[PDB]
Amino acid sequence: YFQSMSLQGKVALVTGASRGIGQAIALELGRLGAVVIGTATSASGAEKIAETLKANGVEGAGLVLDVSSDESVAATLEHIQQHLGQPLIVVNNAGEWFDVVNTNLNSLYRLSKAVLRGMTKARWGRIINIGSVVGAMGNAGQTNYAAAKAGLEGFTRALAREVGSRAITVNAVAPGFIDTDMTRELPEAQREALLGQIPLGRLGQAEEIAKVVGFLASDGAAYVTGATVPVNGGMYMS
Amino acid sequence: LYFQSMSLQGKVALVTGASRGIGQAIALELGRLGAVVIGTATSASGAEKIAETLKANGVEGAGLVLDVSSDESVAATLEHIQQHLGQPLIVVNNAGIRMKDDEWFDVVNTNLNSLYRLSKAVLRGMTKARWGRIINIGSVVGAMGNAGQTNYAAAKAGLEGFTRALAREVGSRAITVNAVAPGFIDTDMTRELPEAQREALLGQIPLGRLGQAEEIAKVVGFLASDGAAYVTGATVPVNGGMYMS
Amino acid sequence: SLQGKVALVTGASRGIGQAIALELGRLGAVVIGTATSASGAEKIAETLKANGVEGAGLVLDVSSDESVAATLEHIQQHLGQPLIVVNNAGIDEWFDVVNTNLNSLYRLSKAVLRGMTKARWGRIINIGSVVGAMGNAGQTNYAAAKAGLEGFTRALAREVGSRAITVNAVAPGFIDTDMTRELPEAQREALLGQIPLGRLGQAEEIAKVVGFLASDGAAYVTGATVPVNGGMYMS
Amino acid sequence: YFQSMSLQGKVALVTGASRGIGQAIALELGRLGAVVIGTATSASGAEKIAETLKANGVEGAGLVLDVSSDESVAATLEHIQQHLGQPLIVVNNAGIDEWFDVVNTNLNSLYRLSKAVLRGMTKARWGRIINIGSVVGAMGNAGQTNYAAAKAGLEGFTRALAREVGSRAITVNAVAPGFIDTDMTRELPEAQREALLGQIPLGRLGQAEEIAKVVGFLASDGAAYVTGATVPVNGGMYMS
Ligand SMILES: CCn1c(NC(=O)Nc2ccccc2OC)nc2ccccc21
Ligand SMILES: CCn1c(NC(=O)Nc2ccccc2OC)nc2ccccc21
């Protein structure tokens, strides 16, 4: 059918939506017809999200959420339920190597567990996990990226297996080197070395992540689950 | 003249093995998205069936006879398409060629040699246009036991590696190369199963059902689009959560 | 040969852990095996003595910072620094189990690394869990634990490599243990039919791989997970 | 006079044994007690192999083999059968936009050889096939492409063949080297060498002997439950 009908009738929760990849996802799910709730860690972030949605003709809301807190999670979901409805599309974009991976996976799990009750009841759902962008400094940066990706992949596949019988899919998107504020002011030598390892020869656009998410949220992705889609211009780091 | 804003309009898509099943659903999905579609089969009747199926669904294009194992068939088929329809810039390779666990070698070797032949031939046009999409379709699970697993895991491993390598080679030209790896989709093999076997098969699939051909096609249609321009070298599994390697 | 080396093997009172303890001892290491109880520890100490292996049995709870620190201090004072460390002890449930096991691996590994850093040599070898149950939940849990094991092992290897410490893992498939022994004949048969070699693995066959990874000739292997599964791959 | 060697009584065929990794594997299997047949593509290679085996006290032979030729394969194996015995340990270390043809041909060669030696293993109900992957051949994107493609084909092939032959207690495994100290790496500029080392957690190149040791373990009885596996030997440098 028509693109702006793809998600009509669905409420999407997108964490970390005030800028960058998260904002582009919020706008793309809106354009596909979802009601969109974007989150930020501050009140002004939340308000910016609400304004950006309105400016682009997307219905929904901006909210304050801290995915590391049980209380923030439970309160936020109760707010959404009462005022907008049950979020059946959930995009986790809000985030040395050990602590970071362990904490991010704990956060994914907390949020996922909380939104699954609604999806179990509806017998339908989409959980999409967004991995971290390539950039960070070092052999340490490489270590950290490969570890986070490996944890993201394994988690996503496990959770998909658990929830599959309820027609809930769980997938992940693993970005490579994407043009965000974080990557834009990386020293020129690191940026160049990164470009030289990307077959397409350019950075990815936030919108190019968002499009993949939008597809995974759609009905035609209903038999994709447990998958991690790399969006990296052909640069594979393991 | 009619200019579409967010569609495959103006693109010519070649879909090999389009007379039934997955290939046919892909041909119809790319047509619905606005491409001109050339579907192929190894026989005149398959080609005719394709041409009729396109016309019934309002899709412009053609059914052609193509044998991907033959240099002559490949070159002739591409020359024909060039002259009459234009340069195919979306190419979907879906044509591949008691099941025992020794059949993996010949099948994987023949199919990769065919993927390579076709891909090489259509790359010239994509290089010249500085745009392209090559999308390789994997083989479905062909049988229920050990041999079935062995042959499916081998074909999927060859497909993944080949796709990633080719993507690296052509990336600088803004040509993406991806693959779609199906799991269990509705087939004769699954239809002719005893009820206990069918139920045990479904119990190995987290979603609890077989996949539809259309559900493969939708993933291919996305890969062909502009918004998948940064996806390359990837193999998207479409298997309801059933992962076998 | 491992003469002159002190090896710590967690979970050594039976099965895979015990076979690893005896194998490293046969290769000449001084061996400290651990159990969660005083009787387990004592059984370990008796087994080592019966096989002529110098070392000790100790009580260790890898989930406790105090147990870890105390245990390592005990070993340092009485036997020396453990430079070969084999982690074989482990604790909708896939999440908590994996998350806790990786937290334990990390705790122990971080503690034993001081001594390896000081020696400029080390071997950490993580043992994966055997397939724990038949069918989908068993597959989910096993694949998840294996995936977390592989990624963790690779990341740690990258962090400690410059100190000539290797970090590797061994991922067993179906091994002849109490779990597989208490299976009904029909289940056992169906299981064998999914294993190309057509038999269950022996605990000793895990121990031999570990014994090799502990050796000098494995010095360029790091970050690797060796599957010991008779050709049965699940993920 | 009597020593119990872990491969005593076994005949090992090692392809590509005249230098480097293949030679170190031939010497290692010999030290472990096997009778060793090393091959090369030329008569002088073969002779060099035979001299090296003799200098190290290893029984066996150097032979000319071209793994791309059915005639050379069948003739060479028949020769070995008649004069030395059935090779029950086989180590494939011989190889020849080019990624395709190289990988595709090497896997076709592995298959030809493997198929030919399997009848003897089937008869004995015991075997070891060990496939050696290519070292990283060049710095840069093409080098990465070719290396990742070869490794991916090697892994998939090795796992499939293992599945096919498992019921006969024949194991099939691969060893995937990273950067090993040989002529290619020995002659890089100091800045490139230092940057290469900085991508290897262990901070050094691997030795040929360190690949040979892993092979020697895989050939042993204690590796009997390892099959289908690809052991990376790369100092922690993982490229895919
Ligand atoms: C947080 C520990 N961890 C994990 N996984 C993890 O924590 N959980 C996990 C991993 C795989 C599958 C399911 C999981 O549940 C968290 N993967 C890692 C990879 C590299 C370093 C650490 C990793
Ligand atoms: C037919 C031999 N073969 C090949 N042959 C091959 O040419 N593979 C290949 C070529 C280019 C790039 C990647 C490749 O494999 C992943 N790949 C296989 C994978 C699994 C089982 C057998 C395979």
Rounded to the nearest 10 degrees, the angle between the axes of helix C203-214 and helix C15-26 is 50
Q: Are D135 and D184 in contact (CB under 8 A)?
A: yes
Query: Taking the C-alpha atoms of B49, B52, B54 and B60 in order, what is their torsion angle to the nearest 10 degrees?
Result: 120
Q: Are A171 and A229 in contact (CB under 8 A)?
A: yes
Q: Are D159 and D176 in contact (CB under 8 A)?
A: no
Nearest CA-CA distance, residue D159 and chain C, Å: 7
In this structure, what token pair is assigned to residue C173? 């498939």
Query: Which strands make up the sheet holding D230-233, listed edge to edge?
Result: D60-64, D35-40, D11-14, D89-92, D127-132, D170-177, D230-233
Of D141, D199, D238, the CB nearest to A238: D238
Rounded CA-CA distance A135/A194 in Å is 8
Cα–Cα distance list, A126 to A156, A218, C116, D124 (Å): 12, 9, 46, 54
Q: Are D71 and D95 in contact (CB under 8 A)?
A: no
Rounded CA-CA distance A127/A216 in Å is 9
Residues in CB range of B211: below 8 A, 6 or more apart: A223, B182, B183, B184, B185, B186, B238, B239, B240
Rounded CA-CA distance B36/A85 in Å is 42
Resolution (A): 1.9
Q: Are C147 and A161 in contact (CB under 8 A)?
A: no
Greatest distance between any 2 Cα atoms in chain A: 51
Query: Taking the C-alpha atoms of D147, D153, D157 and D158 in order, what is their torsion angle to the nearest 10 degrees?
Result: 20
Residue D221 CA, distance from chain mean position: 18
Residue (of D233, D231, D141, D235) closest to D197 by Cα position = D235
Residues in CB range of C70: below 8 A, 6 or more apart: none
Are residues D207 and C220, on separate chains, in Cβ contact within 8 Å? yes
Residue (of A11, A15, A20, A22) closest to A65 by Cα position = A15
Query: Taking the C-alpha atoms of B132, B133, B134 and B137 in order, what is their torsion angle to the nearest 10 degrees?
Result: -170
Q: Are B135 and B118 in contact (CB under 8 A)?
A: no
Residue (of A42, A13, A43, A11) closest to A25 by Cα position = A13
Cα–Cα distance list, B174 to A44, C53, D98, D168 (Å): 40, 64, 20, 49
Determination approach: X-ray
Are residues D99 and B169, on separate chains, in Cβ contact within 8 Å? yes
Region of D125 (left: φ > 0; alpha: ψ -120 to 50; beta: rest) is left
CA atoms within 13 A on the CB side of A162: 22
What single letter denotes the amino acid at residue B132? Answer: G
Residue D175 CA to ligand 1 center (angstroms) comes to 26
Residue (of B83, B95, B75, B77) closest to B15 by Cα position = B95
Beta-strand pair D11-14/D35-40: parallel
- For C19, other C-beta atoms within 10 Å of its C-beta total 23
Nearest chain D residue to C204, by CA: D222
Region of C223 (left: φ > 0; alpha: ψ -120 to 50; beta: rest) is left
Q: N- to C-terminal Cα distance for chain B?
A: 50
Residues in CB range of B108: below 8 A, 6 or more apart: B154, B155, B158
Residue (of D193, A197, D203) closest to C159 by Cα position = D203
Cα–Cα distance list, C51 to B187, C8, C16, C19, C33 (Å): 59, 17, 16, 12, 13
Q: Are D41 and D29 in contact (CB under 8 A)?
A: no
Rounded CA-CA distance B23/B221 in Å is 12
CA atoms within 13 A on the CB side of C45: 10
Residue B228 CA, distance from chain mean position: 16
Rounded CA-CA distance D201/D19 in Å is 27
Backbone angles phi, psi at D95, to 5 degrees: -140, 180
Residue (of D204, D174, D214) closest to D25 by Cα position = D214
Residue D148 CA to ligand 2 center (angstroms) comes to 12
A168 labelled binding-site residue: no
Domains of chain B and any CATH numbers = 1-245 (3.40.50.720)
Beta-strand pair A178-179/A204-205: parallel
* CB of C219 closer than 6 angstroms to any ligand 1 atom: no
Are residues D152 and B168, on separate chains, in Cβ contact within 8 Å? no
Q: Looking at the complex, does the CB of residue D209 fall below 8 Å from at least one CB of chain C?
A: yes
Q: Looking at the complex, does the CB of residue A162 fall below 8 Å from at least one CB of chain C?
A: yes
Q: How deeply is D51 buried, as exposed, middle or buried, from its count of CB atoms within 10 A (0-12, 13-18, 19+)?
A: exposed
Q: Are D208 and D181 in contact (CB under 8 A)?
A: yes
In this structure, what token pair is assigned to residue D112? 């030809």
Cα–Cα distance list, B133 to A174, A191, B136, B238 (Å): 21, 27, 10, 19
Rounded CA-CA distance C14/C176 in Å is 12
Cα–Cα distance list, A131 to A102, A152, A179, D162 (Å): 13, 7, 15, 35
Region of A78 (left: φ > 0; alpha: ψ -120 to 50; beta: rest) is alpha
In this structure, what token pair is assigned to residue B123? 């790359």
Rounded CA-CA distance D195/D193 in Å is 6
Rounded CA-CA distance A63/A50 in Å is 8
What single letter denotes the amino acid at residue A102? Answer: N
Give the per-residue SS3 of chain C.
Answer: CCCCCEEEECCCCCHHHHHHHHHHHHCCCEEEEEECCHHHHHHHHHHHHHCCCCEEEEECCCCCHHHHHHHHHHHHHHCCCCCEEEECCCCCCHHHHHHHHHHHHHHHHHHHHHHHHHHCCEEEEEECCCCCCCCHHHHHHHHHHHHHHHHHHHHHHHHHHHHCEEEEEEEECCECCHHHHCCCHHHHHHHHCCCCCCCCECHHHHHHHHHHHHCHHHCCCCCCEEEECCCCCCC
Residues in CB range of D29: below 8 A, 6 or more apart: D7, D12, D14, D36, D89, D91, D215, D216, D219
Query: What would the DSSP string read from start to end of chain A?
Result: --GGGTTTT-EEEESS-SSHHHHHHHHHHHHTT-EEEEEESSHHHHHHHHHHHHHTT--EEEEE--TT-HHHHHHHHHHHHHHT----EEEE----HHHHHHHHHHHHHHHHHHHHHHHHHHT-EEEEEEPPPS--SHHHHHHHHHHHHHHHHHHHHHHHHHHGGGTEEEEEEEE-SEESHHHHTS-HHHHHHHHHT-TT-SPEEHHHHHHHHHHHHSGGGTT--S-EEEESTT----
Beta-strand pair D127-132/D170-177: parallel
Residue (of B155, B44, B35, B61) closest to B103 by Cα position = B155
Residue (of B76, B85, B172) closest to B132 by Cα position = B172
Residue (of B114, B90, B113) closest to B38 by Cα position = B90
Cα–Cα distance list, D182 to D24, D75, D185, D206 (Å): 12, 32, 6, 9
Rounded CA-CA distance A20/A184 in Å is 12
Query: What would the DSSP string read from start to end of chain D?
Result: -----TTTT-EEEESS-SSHHHHHHHHHHHHTT-EEEEEESSHHHHHHHHHHHHHTT--EEEEE--TT-HHHHHHHHHHHHHHT----EEEE-----THHHHHHHHHHHHHHHHHHHHHHHHHHT-EEEEEEPPPP--SSHHHHHHHHHHHHHHHHHHHHHHHHHGGGTEEEEEEEE-SBSSHHHHTS-HHHHHHHHTTSTT-SPBPHHHHHHHHHHHHSGGGTT--S-EEEESTT----
Q: Are A29 and A91 in contact (CB under 8 A)?
A: yes
Q: Looking at the complex, does the CB of residue C220 fall below 8 Å from at least one CB of chain D?
A: yes
Q: Are C129 and C140 in contact (CB under 8 A)?
A: no
Is the dihedral angle over the CA atoms D15, D222, C194, A164 positive or is it negative? negative
Is the dihedral angle over the CA atoms A199, A205, A206, A209 positive or is it negative? negative
Q: Are D95 and D70 in contact (CB under 8 A)?
A: no
Which residues form the pocket of ligand 2, taking CB atoms under 6 Å from any ligand atom?
B 104-105, 108-109, 112, 154, 157-158, 161-162, 165; D 99-100, 103-104, 107, 149, 152-153, 156-157, 160
Q: Are A41 and A65 in contact (CB under 8 A)?
A: yes
Give the per-residue SS3 of B123-179.
Answer: HHHHHHHCCEEEEEECCCCCCCCHHHHHHHHHHHHHHHHHHHHHHHHHHHHCEEEEE
Rounded CA-CA distance B82/C165 in Å is 60
Q: Are B107 and B97 in contact (CB under 8 A)?
A: yes
Rounded to the nearest 10 degrees, the angle between the axes of helix D99-124 and helix B146-170 is 160
Query: Taking the C-alpha atoms of D174, D175, D176 and D180 in order, what is their torsion angle to the nearest 10 degrees?
Result: -150
Rounded CA-CA distance A44/A65 in Å is 12
What single letter denotes the amino acid at residue C18? Answer: Q
Residue (of A191, A225, A229, A188) closest to B242 by Cα position = A225
Test mutation, A107, A142, A162, chain C, max C CBs within 10 A: A162
Chain D contacts in chain B segment 74-133 (CB below 8 A): 101-102, 104-105, 109, 112-113, 116
Nearest CA-CA distance, residue A140 and chain D, Å: 11
Query: What would the DSSP string read from start to end of chain B?
Result: ----SSSSTT-EEEESS-SSHHHHHHHHHHHHTT-EEEEEESSHHHHHHHHHHHHHTT--EEEEE--TT-HHHHHHHHHHHHHHT----EEEE-------TT-HHHHHHHHHHHHHHHHHHHHHHHHHHT-EEEEEEPPPP--SSHHHHHHHHHHHHHHHHHHHHHHHHHGGGTEEEEEEEE-SBS-HHHHTS-HHHHHHHHTTSTTSSPBPHHHHHHHHHHHHSGGGTT--S-EEEESTT----
Rounded CA-CA distance A34/D63 in Å is 71
